[PDB]
Design an enzyme around this catalytic site. Structure first.
Site, PDB file in Angstrom:
ATOM      1  N   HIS C  41       0.782  -1.229   0.000  1.00 58.27           N
ATOM      2  CA  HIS C  41       0.000   0.000   0.000  1.00 58.27           C
ATOM      3  C   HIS C  41       0.819   1.288   0.000  1.00 58.27           C
ATOM      4  O   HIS C  41       0.233   2.374  -0.090  1.00 58.27           O
ATOM      5  CB  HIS C  41      -1.059   0.028   1.073  1.00 58.27           C
ATOM      6  CG  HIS C  41      -0.531  -0.039   2.455  1.00 58.27           C
ATOM      7  ND1 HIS C  41      -0.618  -1.195   3.223  1.00 58.27           N
ATOM      8  CD2 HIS C  41       0.028   0.911   3.237  1.00 58.27           C
ATOM      9  CE1 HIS C  41      -0.113  -0.948   4.410  1.00 58.27           C
ATOM     10  NE2 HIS C  41       0.306   0.309   4.435  1.00 58.27           N
ATOM     11  N   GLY C 142       2.667   5.565  10.025  1.00 59.32           N
ATOM     12  CA  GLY C 142       4.072   5.479   9.701  1.00 59.32           C
ATOM     13  C   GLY C 142       4.713   4.159  10.045  1.00 59.32           C
ATOM     14  O   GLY C 142       5.838   3.897   9.589  1.00 59.32           O
ATOM     15  N   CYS C 144       3.757   1.087   9.372  1.00 56.61           N
ATOM     16  CA  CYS C 144       3.676   0.009   8.376  1.00 56.61           C
ATOM     17  C   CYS C 144       5.037  -0.322   7.809  1.00 56.61           C
ATOM     18  O   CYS C 144       5.925   0.523   7.649  1.00 56.61           O
ATOM     19  CB  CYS C 144       2.722   0.351   7.300  1.00 56.61           C
ATOM     20  SG  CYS C 144       1.020   0.416   7.833  1.00 56.61           S
TER      21      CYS C 144
HETATM   22  C1  LIG Z   1       0.033   1.990   7.463  1.00 56.61           C
HETATM   23  O1  LIG Z   1      -0.282   1.776   6.060  1.00 56.61           O
HETATM   24  C2  LIG Z   1       1.088   3.060   7.600  1.00 56.61           C
HETATM   25  O2  LIG Z   1       1.756   3.122   8.628  1.00 56.61           O
HETATM   26  N1  LIG Z   1       1.154   3.884   6.513  1.00 56.61           N
HETATM   27  C3  LIG Z   1       2.007   5.063   6.363  1.00 56.61           C
HETATM   28  C4  LIG Z   1       1.253   6.320   6.778  1.00 56.61           C
HETATM   29  C5  LIG Z   1       1.971   7.535   6.811  1.00 56.61           C
HETATM   30  C6  LIG Z   1       1.329   8.720   7.192  1.00 56.61           C
HETATM   31  C7  LIG Z   1      -0.032   8.694   7.532  1.00 56.61           C
HETATM   32  C8  LIG Z   1      -0.751   7.480   7.512  1.00 56.61           C
HETATM   33  C9  LIG Z   1      -0.115   6.291   7.141  1.00 56.61           C
HETATM   34  C10 LIG Z   1      -1.147   1.903   8.465  1.00 56.61           C
HETATM   35  C11 LIG Z   1      -0.829   1.790   9.986  1.00 56.61           C
HETATM   36  C12 LIG Z   1      -2.062   1.835  10.928  1.00 56.61           C
HETATM   37  C13 LIG Z   1      -2.659   3.238  11.105  1.00 56.61           C
HETATM   38  C14 LIG Z   1      -2.581   3.584  12.601  1.00 56.61           C
HETATM   39  N2  LIG Z   1      -2.005   2.386  13.189  1.00 56.61           N
HETATM   40  C15 LIG Z   1      -1.697   1.401  12.340  1.00 56.61           C
HETATM   41  O3  LIG Z   1      -1.213   0.293  12.624  1.00 56.61           O
HETATM   42  N3  LIG Z   1      -2.031   0.876   7.892  1.00 56.61           N
HETATM   43  C16 LIG Z   1      -3.072   1.220   7.116  1.00 56.61           C
HETATM   44  O4  LIG Z   1      -3.373   2.384   6.862  1.00 56.61           O
HETATM   45  O5  LIG Z   1      -3.853   0.119   6.554  1.00 56.61           O
HETATM   46  C17 LIG Z   1      -4.502   0.123   5.281  1.00 56.61           C
HETATM   47  C18 LIG Z   1      -4.670  -1.330   4.822  1.00 56.61           C
HETATM   48  C19 LIG Z   1      -5.842   0.810   5.481  1.00 56.61           C
HETATM   49  C20 LIG Z   1      -3.667   0.871   4.236  1.00 56.61           C
END
Ligand SMILES: *[C@](O)(C(=O)NCc1ccccc1)[C@H](C[C@@H]1CCNC1=O)NC(=O)OC(C)(C)C
Ligand SMILES: *[C@](O)(C(=O)NCc1ccccc1)[C@H](C[C@@H]1CCNC1=O)NC(=O)OC(C)(C)C
Ligand SMILES: *[C@](O)(C(=O)NCc1ccccc1)[C@H](C[C@@H]1CCNC1=O)NC(=O)OC(C)(C)C
Ligand SMILES: *[C@](O)(C(=O)NCc1ccccc1)[C@H](C[C@@H]1CCNC1=O)NC(=O)OC(C)(C)C
Ligand SMILES: *[C@](O)(C(=O)NCc1ccccc1)[C@H](C[C@@H]1CCNC1=O)NC(=O)OC(C)(C)C
Ligand SMILES: *[C@](O)(C(=O)NCc1ccccc1)[C@H](C[C@@H]1CCNC1=O)NC(=O)OC(C)(C)C
Lengths: 299, 300, 299, 300, 299, 299
Positions: C41, C142, C144
């Site tokens: 993603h 962040g 992920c």
């Molecule tokens: C994840 O995709 C992530 O960390 N993305 C980078 C990011 C950077 C800035 C702002 C948002 C995201 C995320 C992690 C989740 C969100 C809060 N706690 C977590 O464990 N996963 C995510 O968004 O899942 C889907 C499948 C919806 C993309």
């Protein structure tokens, strides 16, 4: 030390027990002054079919009674009916009549039963009037009229029960000496059903104090629950409310444990002992009152 | 119906209870004919240190005894010592002496205790002599000399116990009326220790029969175990052997359940009741003999 | 002595963590040889609306990636997609690549999470894969791509998790390094709901053995329950089955307590501690495996 | 979202860990520049009887030391003693020395422990210095010399602990890198005893804020208590005082709950959770600082 | 056979010991029920200058107390002062509180000391209260508050001593649990001096009986001295009077030696053993009571 | 100040004692986990004639054992024989089992005896294993199986002795928990005779240091004797050798007196005290180890 469910000595009451026969029905009665009290179903024509007591008393004849004490006959002069008992006036006054009173028990009172057959005491045991107005005794055919009693510190006998009936459950019901049946059960063969018994919380507290004072302390939780919260829990779990905590102040002081800690401990212990025991009991015990625990531990 | 641990009526025995005082020590004794039996430590100079009974008896003076029945004094004529009791001869014969016998109990025998203080009965309860020759009573300071008894069907009182001590465990020991201490404990302050308390299997069987006859049957398993197999299991699990199965034939017939089925049911129930109970007991009960169950269920 | 939930040391893994940027989305990846694995993603156009991954991968352009390790840029040569991850081929081989393997976890396996933001490790903690294929971690936006790992006795790193999603409950889901999402959750914003977590009975047993061996024994019941009966109880009360009792033979021998006694003790303890504790825990603890208890008590 | 007790990453510290052997005693030390710090009882002749450190240092011979990093031997040049540690000068400077500082912890400070055996890290975990100057770790024979550390936002390592002993209670004590033992315990086998462990009220407040922000709110009572009243209650109930309420202003604003409401909620929750939990904890948790909760909920 | 100075087992007392801190002063206290008894000098501003206790108690603040057991907090509710002790009312009741009583010793009584430091038992030993109201113990800084006790046959603990001071001679003084200091010494730094110790003649007689029963008889003289003569000699030579000869009846009978022969033998042995020994002792021993000798020989 | 022979507190051991009966023979055993260790002569047919143990064990029947604690049954599963002890595998695990280990004593080691009768602790005292592999205790009929122990700083019990016999001299012998009899005495009635006891020189040195530190210095000679010279003298005069002078460094420093001066002082004091005393002892005392003296002076 030790804690044992005991009866008060039965001698003064055994001297008041008599055999009461009407027709071919035999049961027991209690001879105080020149009066013998016994259950009114001694004059019942059957005891298997519904009984018209008004009719049985109106057609009753004195010549059908035979009343005796250790085989010595007593002369019947008359009979009145008061609720579920007869008062049989006799010629001879019981010279062994103890100083006494009649008293009606309240749920949670302890007392003694002298189980009798044919006018003769067979056994004696302590018991509690339950919240549902029954007791758990051991009685078979012939036991009706067995008396219950307490003996005060001054020697005065409180006569408080006369055995009347066994319910379908096996639970036992008597009347007081005025003829009121405890809990308004009927002195008839019937399909009557007692309310479910509530565990007597005040006794359970007494018992846990006794356990502390006999060095049995493994079960003590370090949680506290106040009276109003225990009482709410009790309703939901088959327990009475607890009476004022001040009752227990002597034992609270001697153990350094408050009632509130015991109440919380009851809540936990209700779930099971986990194979351990408390003064040999494998579940909570409501058999002993505060007064009984104090008398057995200290006189 | 029902099953409740009872004492036999106490009247004939209450009339034999007296207060025995020597010096400033008070305890109870039992007045039959012109003899009062009581525990010999009434003449002990101190119940804290080891007691020289020979010395206490040799230096004993009759004028230090005072014996009374419901406050009426009795005249002390003489005293002999028999094992752990004194026989105090008195001037007056107890006119309320019941017909009686002295009997020595065996483990598993049931009897009655009349707990007494200062010569006055306070309570009465049924009890069993355990495998270790103790009982579990309720006695405090002053109870020594409380009698134990049975009453036969003919009215004859068996006098069988006089309370003597509480062991460090809380277990209670008495003597018979010949002065033999049950289990050969000593009537001395000491750290003496009872053997293991074994569940009385004969009573447990009786009790389960009583449960069946009062419609409590949830616990009944459909396994059989024979006597010899149960007896082997018993040794390992804190239970006596069971006596010959034909003892229970009347109750086996009335319930349609054999002893062997009950023995198996005991093995299962040993593990815990779960939440449930049997005639209100939350674990197996060895408090009732066969004879007691039969008497409470049927009479005579 | 003592028992503490710990992580295996994080150095060998921190050297494999990189910052992966596509467009304006930043997350983490893991650089082993000349390949960086990261969640797919990172190339999603939004992450708030449903994602067509086929389309996003087909229209993906390499010039939009920037991949770096402690600020040093890596040259992207290509990208393939495998389930929920990308494998980004880069010019430079990670000279700090540890000896390693990929391994897929099973429910009840313990492992370590290195929580990362922008390519930089922030925190490290031990965790268990639950029966419902989630973990309970602490991750914000962040995170992920944060990896999970175990280190074998020979020094070999098992890479076993890459952080992917937080469910509506707050529970956490990752994929293995093949791109299979644990429990077949979807790497999409969705209304997915995990099964209810089962307490891991094998760990609870390990933990009670640890309590015995640290002299904490107050809770021990003298009841026994066999495996099949515990397993039936477990189903009804939110617990897994227990695995073969032979696993525990060393600890059964050292304590003289059998598994069956602990199983019964669990049944009792499930109802509440009554204000007491076990190694400081106020309720049963399934956080530690047998292997972890043994390693912490004996090496 | 979520809240989990974590350690800061251990890589920069693992590169400073070494095996220190004197005679047949082995433990860990920390290699920074050309100095290895380790606990001084490595030169003790016996860890069973009271130790004369003056004698052990005076009779110490350098040829008995062997110091290694991942099996590569280091040359021992000299040794000084500073309180409860040795500073062992070696020929080689640790080229992986991170930028660092020595810092002494205060009660309530959080830090990280890298548990080590024979010079090799085995595990890593976060921990708090308690009011009684101990920690609750997990350490067995061989752990002495395991370091504790924090890493600042700029990358600078604060070295703050070296493991020294386990008290009879199981509680753990270390020294700082100047050789001061935390809480003035002695690095001697003894029966020494920690003071009472008090719940850290500041952390408990932080933790309840974390619970609110993760939608766990069942426990929140609608009473207020002010600081001075909570602080009086705290003394009586095993809790520290709470620091000035304005520390929590960001979290008070984000949740709409004031500290005073949380203080009251603590008083209630002290009595037990009933069946329930808070972020999985079945009792109040003082494991997390304000700073840790903020970092885990929001970053930086 | 043999004779050895023993303590009664210390388990029932060990769990009643706690650590009591006021300011920076640490000592021990005894936790029974919800009360902790400890010496009042824990609130002293300085143990070098004369202490106004009335003032120190009136100005005392509760927030300066810290009471624990093995690191576990115990909360202070209140404090009263009774002679030389404080009674600290505390939040938790000691669940290991044994059945107990308070008893004040008389000269010649034997008892047990449980020597404690910072709330932790270190040592246990038997000891006698001397005629000068001291004991000869082994105590260093921190021992204050160590309890002394006896255990009756039923398990009941008699609490009888709390360690308070060391005199300039090295002799030790305590109080009972009511706060009376044995011998009316002062719980203050002072120049107080105990009277000269008298040898406990009753114990010396017991000891010689023990020697006879262990086949050590070389010392036995063929002199007799009666009680009144020994008592006169005793006054002049640093010995107590002797109790009635009847006390020794069991041992007189078992050995065939009368007390009067032992009294004479004491008079002779007082002059020196001539290089020989009795049960290994090179001079007369008053360490053992009659009760102790009887318990060790016959039990 | 002061010096007193003490026992380490006995609580952790007390709850491991049980009553073991075979036939009509009763003694004690030690219950750790689900094993009870006891002396094998509990199965002896007679303690007067020579015992064939191989035969007694082969013909032994389990149904003859009865094992209890304070009247509570404990069931026998099986029995093995290891040297002079039985290991009785039993049905219940001791819930009060402390953390422990087995250790075999060497001459000169101090330890604690918990003297027991019929499964019940009566007495506790410190003692030394002598050079002749005996101890001087106080034991009567029923004491067999009384355990000896030491307690390490972490609470870990070293079980090191089980009482087995009294020699014709009155000296006492036990086995370790492996069933080796100290000194290879026989657990049989016999005419075995211990070697003459050697005074433990290391303890005598410790004792003189304790005397210096308690201001008793009248005996101090201005002779020096080195280790090799003292050791030669010792052989001729009933004393062990002395250990390295460095052992005493703390005490040498605190008193300003060297070991060599104390060794000479021992040689002089061996000849007699001349009516004086040292800490109340009328001859040299080897009852206290260096460790004990150090613990009592500084702790
Ligand atoms: C994840 O995709 C992530 O960390 N993305 C980078 C990011 C950077 C800035 C702002 C948002 C995201 C995320 C992690 C989740 C969100 C809060 N706690 C977590 O464990 N996963 C995510 O968004 O899942 C889907 C499948 C919806 C993309
Ligand atoms: C009771 O009336 C009784 O004991 N009657 C005498 C008698 C004599 C011979 C045969 C039967 C009855 C009786 C006691 C019950 C029966 C069994 N256990 C008991 O407690 N009560 C009774 O029958 O109640 C009614 C009201 C039906 C008459
Ligand atoms: C018993 O002798 C007794 O009851 N004595 C009278 C008494 C009166 C006042 C104070 C103390 C004693 C006694 C009974 C015990 C006490 C607790 N429960 C009991 O069963 N036994 C007793 O003292 O026996 C020996 C042999 C020790 C004297
Ligand atoms: C500690 O010094 C240590 O870890 N020593 C090395 C070692 C190796 C083998 C066997 C024993 C010891 C020790 C750590 C303790 C032990 C249990 N848990 C711990 O935290 N401390 C220690 O021994 O300190 C003193 C001051 C008593 C020597
Ligand atoms: C006793 O007060 C004690 O143990 N106090 C703890 C303590 C010790 C030193 C410094 C601060 C606090 C102490 C016991 C004495 C000391 C030496 N041996 C003992 O038995 N008592 C004491 O010093 O007495 C007075 C009354 C002067 C305070
Ligand atoms: C020891 O066997 C013991 O205590 N036995 C119980 C016992 C005692 C007498 C009669 C039957 C059963 C005993 C200990 C001795 C006795 C005197 N003091 C002691 O230390 N041991 C013993 O008699 O030894 C042999 C090996 C001969 C059986």
């Amino acid at each position: 030390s030790g804690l044992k469910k005991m009866a008060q000595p039965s001698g003064c009451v055994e001297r008041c027990v008599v055999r009461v026969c009407y027709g071919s029905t035999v049961l027991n009665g209690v001879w105080l002054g020149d009066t013998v009290t016994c259950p009114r179903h001694v004059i019942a024509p059957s005891t298997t079919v519904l009984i018209d007591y008004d009719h049985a008393y109106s057609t009753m004849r004195l010549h059908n009674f035979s009343v005796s004490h250790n085989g010595v006959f007593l002369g019947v002069v008359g009979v009145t009916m008061h609720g579920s008992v007869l008062r049989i006036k006799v010629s001879q006054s019981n010279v062994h009549t103890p100083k006494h009173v009649f008293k009606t028990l309240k749920p949670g009172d302890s007392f003694n039963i002298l189980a009798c057959y044919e006018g003769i005491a067979s056994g004696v045991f302590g018991v509690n009037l339950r919240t549902n107005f029954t007791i758990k005794g051991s009685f078979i055919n012939g036991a009706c009229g067995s008396p219950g009693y307490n003996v005060r510190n001054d020697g005065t006998v409180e006569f408080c029960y006369l055995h009347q009936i066994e319910l379908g459950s096996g639970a036992h019901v008597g009347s007081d000496f005025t003829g009121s049946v405890y809990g308004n059960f009927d002195d008839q063969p019937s399909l009557q059903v007692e309310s479910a018994n509530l565990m007597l919380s005040d006794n359970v507290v007494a018992f846990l104090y006794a356990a502390l004072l006999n060095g049995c302390r493994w079960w003590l939780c370090s949680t506290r629950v106040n009276v109003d919260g225990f009482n709410e829990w009790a309703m939901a779990n088959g327990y009475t409310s607890v009476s004022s905590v001040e009752c227990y102040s002597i034992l609270a002081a001697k153990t350094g444990v408050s009632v509130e800690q015991l109440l919380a401990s009851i809540q936990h212990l209700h779930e099971g002992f986990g194979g351990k025991n408390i003064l040999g009991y494998s579940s909570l015990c409501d058999e002993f009152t505060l007064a009984e625990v104090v008398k057995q531990m200290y006189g």
